[PDB]
Design a protein around this ligand. Structure first.
Ligand SMILES: Nc1nc2c(ncn2[C@@H]2O[C@H](COP(=O)(O)OP(=O)(O)OP(=O)(O)O)[C@@H](O)[C@H]2O)c(=O)[nH]1
Ligand SMILES: Nc1nc2c(ncn2[C@@H]2O[C@H](COP(=O)(O)OP(=O)(O)OP(=O)(O)O)[C@@H](O)[C@H]2O)c(=O)[nH]1
Ligand SMILES: Nc1nc2c(ncn2[C@@H]2O[C@H](COP(=O)(O)OP(=O)(O)OP(=O)(O)O)[C@@H](O)[C@H]2O)c(=O)[nH]1
Lengths: 115, 51, 427, 438, 427
């Protein structure tokens, strides 16, 4: 009555298809009378352990809706930004403009901007 | 070089257990489902008679 | 510093980028959870080229995932590394594709183009300065081509100074599954050659052939196919993130690679591919790998360039090598087939040596080629396009969307122009 | 999300529906109560059933279908059957009067006062649905109640809902067996009304279904149970893409886009390859190659058409189960190299591949085989015009001697509508050879 | 350095090559697994003449196995040294030869010549600079003759600067088993004499008699016969691989052996063959070996040149000898029969001495002969050809393949030219 006993399994199958003994609402194999309508043959037998599917792979969508909930992201934000420099030095900071923005080293003879 | 060969050798040594093992249950699952069907076949034949 | 932003587009790129990304983290040694186990200093040093820093030492992939079908995205999110991908980076729509190009190009794109522009520019501002961006999509893929054509058109104007790397797969020449693919291919390539700078051309048939050739496993997964192409895209990126005397910048490559503007179609090439008995047998040396590097069978992109000639060739070498072996190897192949190159340019070979080996092997190499082997590709689709357009079949859907015959005219007219140009330069 | 609504007009169309969810409840393991065992699958109506059932916070899997009928007989014992508790009472739309096989009677006399109630159902089904890709229509061309009543509703659901898909399924009339001689009348009465509104119509024929039964299934005395279990698997296979996933997954819209070449003609042919007895698959082997050769063997199709008398346009193979592209792409490549298979020169490609790793399962107390590799073959060819050619010569005789007309004109109708359809049919054939001629 | 690559062709060469390779594997002391056990430095140093180096100290056989029948390849693969043979080098066809010369020469060869050339040129690129190549096959062996005639022709224009060594066995003169054999041989020999420079002549009937003469063991296996011929073929190759004052190059030999172009057919000769009690009844001395090497029964190639005369003779001596004895041995045989030589050339004897004895016996030798004993060989087949071409028996197969009787005309005409050439020069 245990599916994994008779066959191998994917080890993630729901306990429904691992335990087929819980399908109690199916036909009770009543003794057939002279008045046996053909239409009642539909779903008249409960499945056995062998009818259970080997593998199971649902189309899970939990993350989707919990992400697809509400609206979808859109930039009404203030377009704040800082233009960076063309140098990696945490001290020098020069861009396409303002190229004279750096630490001036220490000259000994000619003072600042001699020319 | 030897470690590379050692890594090279062990990988080849593998993947053979994978091939061989799959074959047996293929035979097993075949045979198990085979026996079910004769049991199934005698069932309907049994069912026919009291009908 | 200079970095790259990735775009995961189309339902194929959804597999592509996923396998592409997991290779990177495993190469760098980040666990599936994300808490990097510090083991190599250099990969710790040059990880901000692609990832940013989160709290607690997790490294956020700076990529954007775009689609329409939740189930594929749910599978991606449930993948081995969906947790390391951001919900902030998952963009999509409520509609189903039908993989109509026009729907995703004019109708479906219209309400998502704004949002995808929003996420990229923020992430563009989240980072400092780029080399450019790379895109995973397909030319014949319904939604990926549709979405990409808009972005590459839109990404071009505001940032016309960066690299518009693209990674598209050519569908199988024998059969494209869907009949509308040649319409999608012909429509796409018009703006592609207009907007792009670099394109990788990939075909699945050669992937099946190389499976028969060296993989020899009969039945691999398409993810195993992704495992191969991602390794190729891994190698081209190893240059930038890894040290060693090889000039890594793609522009350092591209200026060396493209002689004239309309040349964007390039083919990959990869190094040791090994079969069952040969792993314990291959006497791995520079000569044998270079031979295997330049093998017509080692080709995987479109077809054999044996039919045509070689315009530009560039191979990157990963592992512990020296500047000399590649030198005489170049001379050996220089004299091996001197005539099979074009007399227009001699010494069209560009060699780069990545000193750090990969994880699993030491001597590996990637090759990028621009030969005269794309003619067979687009002449085929030319007869497909002309024949299917000979009687405008399957065209009623596009007219309802708002399409007419006219765009097909200049598209093939633009397509015919590049056909003649390819023969004109070489032949 | 990924859901649709099934509509079942005609007491002919109701047993065939009845089998579907009996089958559907099987792979889902649904108890007739509508509840699962002590384990956890309940919620807001959301798991594998959500695409088909509505197991809402009430915890009972509510099928997303409406069964409409005009004779209360058959709809009542099913309301006393096994899964009647699962079935919604007034979704089982019943009727107290019949159409007398008259297409117009079921389209004018009583359909007016009933559709509005059904229109209440469709909006109440539409609002709860989220993705609602389209509809699933099960009917019959020669319907005592299927023909006339469906024609009105499909017109009415078209005018308000013209932006979503409508999938039509009907038993095609037996080419040489006629249970009614008014059956020809209402048939093209349906087609000419439905040609300009129907999205995709799929037809099958019961005679060849019987022919398969004692050819390879080896059943000389089958029943509707076998007939419906057969077709029930067919719709199950095409819905497995919704139910499971695969190497690649394809939705109804792609089938719409890629199968129909041009407007009006939207009538492909289905087929399912591993039709075989349990004892035959027992000691034999199944693989892509032989099921590919068999699926293109002419005698395995349920429509009395010779493909050698026609030419192929589209083909959709939906390989369900453990398969790999390698042999598949190689096997189909051999098919393209085949010479007897004559596609039209217009389409270099006509092959729509759908892969689903899930192996199709058996039905309890059933008669099919145990299959790991199964494929459904949606195809369209030009060998179909003979059926309408078989139709038209039937009419031009009977219409000339205008039999049975007093019945139709007596209840208020005229011959112009009978006159319009024949050239509409004549237009239908002439369109076939023009697209047939390259 | 100068090396040699081998070709294993024809279903007989399939038996021949393995035994010959197993002879080489054991003579240098490599285990069947391949891990060479270093015991002799000279064989350790000079294995690169035939084997390259794979990792783990294993010496790869640089040969190609080619056939159409897989079971033969399966058998040699399942052999004691098949693990030392390569699935890389296992090239085979999806066709049954039927042992028809034309089929394997025009139909089956067409799709097989492409791949085998790729392997050998890859093998040519694998090594540095050849002495040339050697081929094991049969002139009467249909799959060997069909392919071999094709391959020798192609390798002529490819590498016209190397040695085209051929090792073919002549069918039994009494019965050829296959009845179309003279058709096959006449076809093949026409291309063989055109493309070759050296050939060895081998006949099994002579080999059968030798067992009745000296082996005396009644019932041997064909593999035992392979040991005999391999020992001869190995012996002529010992001079290259081993040190000692003797000139080894086949070019050293061939120019000394070839006075005129049409001399390609040569007969071998071997040294002491010993019977039951004679192993301990022989005092091993050069004079008695000088006797037995020049014995009318000791020959094994075709038949007795007693009917004719000798053109050129060359003997290589393996063991601890001196030039003085072979010198006085040379004088003794010179005067023993001075008339039986040809007055055209005096001193037509060329001697080499290998100082390295074989493993198992100390003083040995090998002989290669060019005499007037081939006339009866191709006379024999001439009446066979004329008799069967008298009424064109068994021809409808060849006509259907696309062949005509005209090819047979210049075929036999070329041999008739060779018949006079051998006849005229000596007679
Ligand atoms: N992910 C994935 N894509 C594949 C595979 N095999 C082929 N493809 C192709 O990759 C293409 C690109 O994917 P997308 O651009 O996302 O496709 P799409 O726009 O949604 O429309 P379709 O092409 O119809 O799927 C598809 O057209 C497929 O034909 C596969 O195994 N996995
Ligand atoms: N779909 C279906 N068709 C059936 C079944 N049994 C027989 N048939 C065939 O399908 C046709 C049924 O059409 P109709 O008889 O007009 O069905 P209806 O319009 O629902 O109303 P009724 O005439 O009362 O049955 C018959 O002519 C039969 O040939 C069945 O169970 N289902
Ligand atoms: N291997 C092997 N070959 C033999 C033996 N005896 C004679 N032979 C001959 O050696 C010849 C050469 O073999 P192949 O060239 O491979 O012959 P083939 O092309 O396959 O066709 P056939 O010559 O008709 O057998 C054959 O024709 C045989 O007749 C033997 O004992 N073993």
């Amino acid at each position: 009555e245990k599916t994994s006993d008779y066959y191998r399994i994917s080890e993630k199958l729901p306990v429904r298809f691992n335990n087929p003994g819980w399908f109690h609402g199916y036909g009770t194999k009543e003794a057939v009378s002279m008045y046996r309508t053909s239409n009642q043959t539909y779903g008249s037998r409960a499945p056995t352990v062998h009818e259970m599917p080997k593998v199971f792979y649902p189309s899970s969508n939990k993350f989707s809706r919990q992400h697809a909930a509400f609206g979808m992201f859109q930039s009404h934000n203030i377009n704040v930004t800082l233009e960076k420099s063309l140098v990696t030095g945490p001290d020098n900071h020069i861009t396409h403009y303002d190229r004279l923005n750096f630490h001036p080293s220490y000259n000994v003879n000619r003072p600042s901007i001699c020319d | 070089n030897m470690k590379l060969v050692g890594r090279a050798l062990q990988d080849l040594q593998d993947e053979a257990d994978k091939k061989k093992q799959k074959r047996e249950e293929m035979g097993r699952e075949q045979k198990i489902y085979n026996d079910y069907l004769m049991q199934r076949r005698e069932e309907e034949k049994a069912q026919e008679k009291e009908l | 510093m200079r970095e790259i932003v990735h775009l995961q587009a189309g339902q194929c790129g959804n597999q592509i980028g996923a396998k592409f990304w997991e290779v990177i983290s495993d190469e760098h040694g980040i666990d599936p959870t994300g808490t990097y186990h510090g083991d190599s200093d250099l990969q710790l040093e040059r990880i901000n080229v692609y990832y940013n820093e989160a709290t607690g030492g997790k490294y956020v992939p700076r990529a954007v995932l775009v689609d329409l079908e939740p189930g594929t995205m749910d599978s991606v999110r449930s993948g081995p590394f969906g947790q390391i991908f951001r919900p902030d980076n998952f963009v999509f729509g409520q509609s189903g594709a039908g993989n109509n190009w026009a729907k995703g190009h004019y109708t479906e794109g219209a309400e998502l183009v704004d949002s995808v522009l929003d996420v990229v520019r923020k992430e563009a501002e989240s980072c400092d300065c780029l080399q450019g961006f790379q895109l995973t999509h397909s030319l014949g893929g319904g939604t990926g081509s549709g979405m990409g054509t808009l972005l590459i058109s839109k990404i071009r104007e505001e940032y016309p100074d960066r690299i518009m790397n693209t990674f598209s797969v050519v569908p199988s020449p024998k059969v494209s599954d869907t009949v509308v693919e040649p319409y999608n291919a012909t429509l796409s390539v018009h703006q592609l050659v207009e907007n792009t700078d670099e394109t990788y051309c990939i075909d699945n048939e050669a992937l099946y052939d190389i499976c028969f050739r060296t993989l020899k496993l009969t039945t691999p997964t398409y993810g195993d196919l992704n495992h191969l192409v991602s390794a190729t895209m891994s190698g081209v990126t190893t240059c930038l993130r890894f040290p060693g005397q090889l000039n890594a910048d793609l522009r350092k490559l591209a200026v060396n690679m493209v002689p004239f503007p309309r040349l964007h179609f390039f083919m990959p090439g990869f190094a040791p591919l090994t079969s069952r008995g040969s792993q314990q047998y291959r006497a791995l040396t520079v000569p044998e790998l270079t031979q295997q590097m330049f093998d017509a069978k080692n080709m995987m992109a479109a077809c054999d360039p044996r039919h045509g000639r070689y315009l530009t060739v560039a191979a990157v070498f990963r592992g512990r090598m020296s500047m000399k072996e590649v030198d005489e190897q170049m001379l050996n192949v220089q004299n091996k087939n001197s005539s099979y190159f074009v007399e227009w340019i001699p010494n069209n070979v560009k060699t780069a040596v990545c000193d750090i080996p990969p994880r699993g092997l030491k001597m590996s190499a990637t090759f990028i080629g621009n030969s005269t082997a794309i003619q067979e590709l687009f002449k085929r689709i030319s007869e497909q396009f002309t024949a299917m357009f000979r009687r405008k079949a399957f065209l009623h859907w596009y007219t309802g969307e708002g399409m007419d015959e006219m765009e097909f005219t200049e598209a093939e007219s633009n397509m015919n122009d590049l056909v003649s140009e390819y023969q004109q330069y070489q032949d | 999300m990924r859901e649709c609504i099934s509509i079942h007009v005609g007491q002919a169309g109701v047993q065939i529906g009845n089998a579907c969810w009996e089958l559907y409840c099987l792979e889902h393991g649904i108890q007739p109560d509508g509840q699962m065992p002590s384990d956890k699958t309940i919620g807001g109506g959301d798991d594998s059933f959500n695409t088909f059932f509505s197991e809402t916070g009430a915890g009972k899997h509510v099928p997303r279908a409406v069964f409409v009928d005009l004779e209360p007989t058959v709809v009542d014992e099913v309301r006393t059957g096994t899964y009647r508790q699962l079935f919604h009472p007034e979704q089982l739309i019943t009727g107290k009067e019949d159409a007398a096989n008259n297409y117009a009677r079921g389209h004018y006399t009583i359909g007016k006062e009933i559709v509005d109630l059904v229109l209440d159902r469709i909006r109440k089904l539409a609002d709860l649905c989220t993705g609602l890709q389209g509809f699933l229509i099960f009917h019959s061309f020669g319907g005592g109640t299927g023909s006339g009543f469906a024609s009105l509703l499909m017109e009415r659901l078209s005018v308000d809902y013209g932006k979503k898909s409508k999938l039509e399924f009907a038993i095609y009339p037996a080419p040489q067996v006629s249970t009614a001689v008014v059956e020809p009348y209402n048939s093209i009465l349906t087609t000419h009304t439905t040609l300009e509104h129907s999205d995709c119509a799929f037809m099958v024929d019961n005679e060849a279904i019987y022919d398969i039964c004692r050819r390879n299934l080896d059943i000389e005395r089958p029943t509707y149970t076998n007939l419906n279990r057969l077709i029930g698997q067919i719709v199950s296979s095409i819905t497995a893409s919704l139910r499971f996933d695969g190497a690649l997954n394809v939705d109804l819209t792609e089938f719409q886009t890629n199968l129909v070449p041009y407007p009006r003609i939207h009538f492909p042919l289905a087929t399912y390859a591993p039709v075989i007895s349990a004892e035959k698959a027992y000691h034999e082997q199944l693989s892509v190659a032989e099921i590919t050769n068999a699926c293109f063997e002419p005698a395995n199709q349920m429509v009395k058409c010779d493909p050698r008398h026609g030419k192929y346009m589209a083909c959709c193979m939906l390989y369900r189960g453990d398969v790999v592209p390698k042999d598949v792409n190689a096997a189909i490549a051999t098919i393209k190299t085949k010479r007897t298979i004559q596609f039209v020169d217009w389409c270099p490609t006509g092959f729509k591949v759908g892969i689903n790793y899930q192996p199709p399962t058996v039905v309890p107390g059933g008669d099919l085989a145990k299959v790991q590799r199964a494929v459904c073959m949606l195809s369209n060819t030009t060998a179909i015009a003979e059926a309408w050619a078989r139709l038209d010569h039937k009419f031009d005789l009977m219409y000339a001697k205008r039999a049975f007309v007093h019945w139709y004109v007596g209840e208020g109708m005229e011959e112009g509508e009978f006159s319009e359809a024949r050239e509409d049919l004549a237009a239908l054939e002439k369109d076939y050879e023009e697209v047939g001629v390259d």
